[PDB]
Amino acid sequence: KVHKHIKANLCGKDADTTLFLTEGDSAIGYLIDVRDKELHGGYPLRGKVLNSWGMSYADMLKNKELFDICAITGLVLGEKAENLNYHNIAIMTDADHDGLGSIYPSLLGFFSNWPELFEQGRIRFVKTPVIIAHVGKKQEWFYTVAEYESAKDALPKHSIRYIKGLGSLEKSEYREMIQNPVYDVVKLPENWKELFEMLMGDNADLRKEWMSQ
Amino acid sequence: KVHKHIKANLCGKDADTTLFLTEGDSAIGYLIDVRDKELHGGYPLRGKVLNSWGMSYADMLKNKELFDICAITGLVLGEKAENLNYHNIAIMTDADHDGLGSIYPSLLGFFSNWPELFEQGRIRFVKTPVIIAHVGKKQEWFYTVAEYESAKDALPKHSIRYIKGLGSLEKSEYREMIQNPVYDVVKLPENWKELFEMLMGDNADLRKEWMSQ
Amino acid sequence: MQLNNRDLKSIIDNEALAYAMYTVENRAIPNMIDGFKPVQRFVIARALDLARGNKDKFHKLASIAGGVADLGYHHGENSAQDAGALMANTWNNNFPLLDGQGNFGSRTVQKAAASRYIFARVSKNFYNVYKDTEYAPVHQDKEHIPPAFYLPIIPTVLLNGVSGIATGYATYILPHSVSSVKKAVLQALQGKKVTKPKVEFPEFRGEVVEIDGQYEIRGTYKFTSRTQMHITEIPYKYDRETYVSKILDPLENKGFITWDDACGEHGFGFKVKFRKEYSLSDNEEERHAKIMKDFGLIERRSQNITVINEKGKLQVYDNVVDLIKDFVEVRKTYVQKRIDNKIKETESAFRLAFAKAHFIKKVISGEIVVQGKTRKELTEELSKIDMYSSYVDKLVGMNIFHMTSDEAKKLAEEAKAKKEENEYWKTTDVVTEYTKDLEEIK
Amino acid sequence: MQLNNRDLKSIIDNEALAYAMYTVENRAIPNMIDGFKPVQRFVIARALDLARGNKDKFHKLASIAGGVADLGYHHGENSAQDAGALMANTWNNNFPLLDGQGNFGSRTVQKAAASRYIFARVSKNFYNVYKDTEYAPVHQDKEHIPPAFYLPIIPTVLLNGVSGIATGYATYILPHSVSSVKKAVLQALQGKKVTKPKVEFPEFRGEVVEIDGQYEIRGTYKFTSRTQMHITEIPYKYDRETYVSKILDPLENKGFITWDDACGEHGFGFKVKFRKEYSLSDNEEERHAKIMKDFGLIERRSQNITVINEKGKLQVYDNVVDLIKDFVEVRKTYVQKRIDNKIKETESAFRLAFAKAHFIKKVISGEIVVQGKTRKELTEELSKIDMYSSYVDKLVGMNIFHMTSDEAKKLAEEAKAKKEENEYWKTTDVVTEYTKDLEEIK
């Protein structure tokens, strides 16, 4: 059907099949060998994501990496999302700002077209160790720089390894994070069409205030 | 029509319209600035040319560069060619070994399927300068690597700028080459058919024997 | 199998704030002082590293933009090539910082070759206006090898003209002249009223007229007869293909006028004849208005000055004069920092040279014994002198060539020069040094 | 527009022959001396220049092949990147001449990352075997800075295994073990009969056998019982996907076998269980043969040795033994050349050291009147003395810390010990130096 979609052997059923929207092709090239036989599929996101906020569904679907995601998954733009091919979306990006601050909120805004999914927890963000340390057998896995800054002296001596993106992870670390995942479950607050119109809207004047307070 | 092909104002009509066959898109881009829009055409060749000798007529119109060459000029492989859209075919391959020894002879072998165009003089090679030098008070063109050594001592003062590729030519020398062409007309000898089985043929023994000498 | 539950809010406040502030402060808005976006700073730092001693070498743009990843760059490698290609253009740069070589195109047809075939080097302009690079600040990050910003003499953010777009803010600065900007900075340095610098679009034979902050770019025609005129210059926005496809061809469609192409190596040059359908009212004001309105020759532009101050925060200005005054104040502070650093360095150099001269005079007079000691022995027996205790290894680390007869006089002259420059740095204030550096710009 | 007449026969005899002569001797057939194709020579030379002081630093391949063009490469930049990526493999190389860091894959999965998002450096193996590169012959081309070929100790062409097509010729050489190659080189050096080196694939748990020129590579299986077995090793040509989808699943479909994986670090292990359809015979001979043939643990590969000799012309060797014999025959001459160059170098160094010792002894004695002399007078007095006549520039250019009463006798002892390394390179032959460099191979 669509290429670069690594299928899961149990796709199209009611079990917890998980899709990992890794950002790149190297991440999925590493994932294919280390993933589980079932309940694990991947689709790369090449480049930045189109803003899915405001325009019609017909015009919105005219982008490649929205038609692709709506084809791999059961997500139909203008109807309820219950008969999905998979069961959980597991968005994973790099450790840089471009990952969690541009691709991640764009995907969240696109998935906001079906708000029914958020309180079911079937959209999640896979964590990624920004800092890895090999203290002998011990594998320190710091997911944000604050933890490593606050834990630089609690351990006798460690050797850090700055992870640039998903292509800098070794096969063992990718396998560990792929069968032992640390998920961030995202839930919409009471107001969600008030910060997403703020962030993905055309009126930059709201953002003029937003980056000040 | 056909992309990457720049037409003329008298294509399909009686005139000495030329279809230059370059080896790179940079050459076509520079030509479009100098192309006399009524007596000049153009089409670039991306990769090495398929060895067309010995292949069936059904499997020859499968390589894109061979389909577009036979479509732009109007040449038909089977029947005689006398209604060409261009009066002349010009090979403006590079001065390196890969252009003068692989693309040029392979294109000659492909064009040999209609031998008539060889005695009419409608197929020729645009010789390309190599050792362009500031001999005396202006730029001087040398066409072969051996010609430089043939006249190296005779030059009072000069500079050296090797033409590695067709993209290394600026607009002035390209204009001189196009508006004042130097052509080499290819005439096939009596044993032309037995000379294209010795290089395009599927018998490495004859190639080994020739290469030994 | 950890499932941390975090709200959708306080995600926009932690990473989306992080990404937007990152685009504003570190991606696509030039700093006030050096005028560089950080990617351009990385590219130019790598270019200076590649220059070393042989600064005239034309390195490829796949090499200048290939070793930037070990200086602090995180955002790929095919984007520093384009960033290095845009500052290497030989026709779109009013004050180029990277001197280039390759198919850059021209104003007639504007299409450059692939960035991987473009050769670049640090231009003479960079060595002219940028100074005190070793007195530049230090980024708080350890990985960010290049300084926080460089220290030019004039505001570079105005000369070449910039257009950056970030999240929530954007900047657009038209290309100002080098003469007008230099004059304005000289006026602001000496505490005088600052005259607005003039826009000086590169290789332009037209003129710019500012009206209500809406700078108008205008070309020039020439009526050689009653039914023939010659368009001599067209506004900078246009190229030949756009001019033909947008104005003249339509004009031909109107049938009102017929034109000819006289373009050459020089700038745009056209000829045109008028048919009966085109009005030719003798009043030259109406004719001028008609020629302007139907033959282009008028481009309206406005500035959106938005820069990053020395504190790393955004600042939106309203006039070039205020930016020039703020830049001159910050550069005066950095000039005072340079003054302090230089007086300390020259004092240290003068002490070192004085010790060298005294030791050379002692050995030429035989006061010190050189035969019979060791490394530690000689070091201990010479470092016991209080005035020789400052430097011992470097003081003794010179040659028989160095302890020569006339070399003693040469060392005395060097000490005299060190003293002279020490008094020069002790006496000279910020204004004198700044005007000396400003007058040296071509 | 001028017309000249050319014949197709002259075209093929002048133009196409030049291309045929090119991609045989200059593009895709390894030099027998060093086993490097011309692109790999450029990549290795660029890596050598990049290493400099930090030999352990990992440089990017995009930077490793982004400067071969100035080294004489006339063919692009991506081809050199791919050649370096293949060269810098970690597992496929029996004797890695380029240590690599990146996603090189393994025997289980064979796919590099991007040939640019990987790092490479000169491995310790290269600095071991490639003992001499300065004395290598110079290319006839004036723009070919890398030598004609490098000068390794053992022939590295058959160490890793080359495979290169050409026009009218082709080459295919199997990998060989370093120990067997070293033994063969030793035997050819000291005149005894040269045994055939054994084929050793990297991280290979199987065994190879020579059958009348062909090489049979056999996998290893152990019968757990009369129902199931464990395949521990497979031939080198089989990847995981190819083995699974080409010979395992086909037979598994027809009720024959039931297999499962045991891959790990030293992976490619499989466990299989025999069904009823698979008619296993209790006779061990035919059972062994049928198990070897059905699962394809048996492969046969034939060498196709065609190499560029010292003269630059193609040469075909029927046996690897003749290859090694000719290799050591020419390496004898190259090592003798190295011996002569080191003789000259040691002679010059001994002259310099003795001149330095005499100069120090004379200044300690005080006979040299350094008082009241300049550089001109110093040179005038020094060049008149015969032993100081040869060396003037660097003979009187030492730092003071270099000379000392105790370091006077230290430098005298150093000059005395220089006789030992002068005699080392004099009273020996090719056999001794070659044997010592052969013993230094781990």
Add this chain to the structure above:
DNA sequence: TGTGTAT
């Protein structure tokens, strides 16, 4: 049908 250096 692979295998490695070039357009």
Add this chain to the structure above:
DNA sequence: ATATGTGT
């Protein structure tokens, strides 16, 4: 509706 310049 469109250009400009760093990112994926």
Add this chain to the structure above:
DNA sequence: ATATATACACA
């Protein structure tokens, strides 16, 4: 960031 097609020669 990836995805696009040919030559050549032996097994």
Add this chain to the structure above:
DNA sequence: ATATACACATAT
């Protein structure tokens, strides 16, 4: 070697 698309803001 070239072709492959989107994010951002604000005049015009």
